[PDB]
Amino acid sequence: LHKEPATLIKAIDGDTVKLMYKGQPMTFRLLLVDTPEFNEKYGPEASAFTKKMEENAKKIEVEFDKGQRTDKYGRGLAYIYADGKMVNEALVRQGLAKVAYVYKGNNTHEQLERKAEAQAKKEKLNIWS
Numbered sequence: 001l002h003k004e005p006a007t008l009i010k011a012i013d014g015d016t017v018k019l020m021y022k023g024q025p026m027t028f029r030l031l032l033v034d035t036p037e038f039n040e041k042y043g044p045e046a047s048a049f050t051k052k053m054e055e056n057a058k059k060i061e062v063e064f065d066k067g068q069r070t071d072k073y074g075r076g077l078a079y080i081y082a083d084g085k086m087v088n089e090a091l092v093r094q095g096l097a098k099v100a101y102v103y104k105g106n107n108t109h110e111q112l113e114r115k116a117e118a119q120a121k122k123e124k125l126n127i128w129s
C-alpha cells in the first residue's frame with residue numbers, strides 16, 4: 001500500500017471525514033473501524049478526537065487498501081494519516097472505536113488494529129470501561 005496526499009475540507013465524526021483527494025471533495029469512511037454515532041455513548045468523544053487529530057495535522061494522507069475504494073454510498077474507503085499517524089489505529093488504541101467491518105481483500109492493517117484494541121481493552125479505556 002502507499003500513502004497519497006489529501007487536504008482536510010471538514011471534520012465530520014469519529015469515522016468519517018470530508019477530504020479533498022485528487023482535487024475533488026469526497027467523504028471518506030475509515031477502514032476497519034466503527035465509532036459510535038454522535039448521538040451515542042462516546043460519539044462526541046470520538047468525533048472530538050478525530051477532529052483534533054485531522055485539524056491539527058500539517059499533512060493528511062490517504063491510503064487505499066487492495067480492494068474496493070468506495071462503498072455503496074460513494075464514500076472513499078481508506079486508512080487516513082495525520083502527520084504520519086494513522087487515525088484508524090489511534091481511534092482503536094484509545095478505545096474510541098471498535099475493530100469492525102473487516103472484509104476480505106481490504107484488511108491489510110487488521111492485525112495492527114486488533115493489537116491496539118487489545119491494549120485499549122486491557123487499559124479499560126472509554127468504550128471498554
Ligand SMILES: Cc1cn([C@H]2C[C@H](OP(=O)(O)O)[C@@H](COP(=O)(O)O)O2)c(=O)[nH]c1=O
Nearest residue numbers: 015029030031032033034071072077101103
Ligand atoms: C467501513 C465500511 C463500511 N461499509 C458499509 C457497510 C455498512 O452498510 P449499512 O449502511 O447497510 O449498515 C455501512 C456502515 O457504515 P457506518 O458505520 O458509517 O454507518 O457502510 C462498507 O461497505 N465497507 C466498509 O469498509
Ligand SMILES: [Ca+2]
Nearest residue numbers: 034035036037
Ligand atoms: Ca459509525
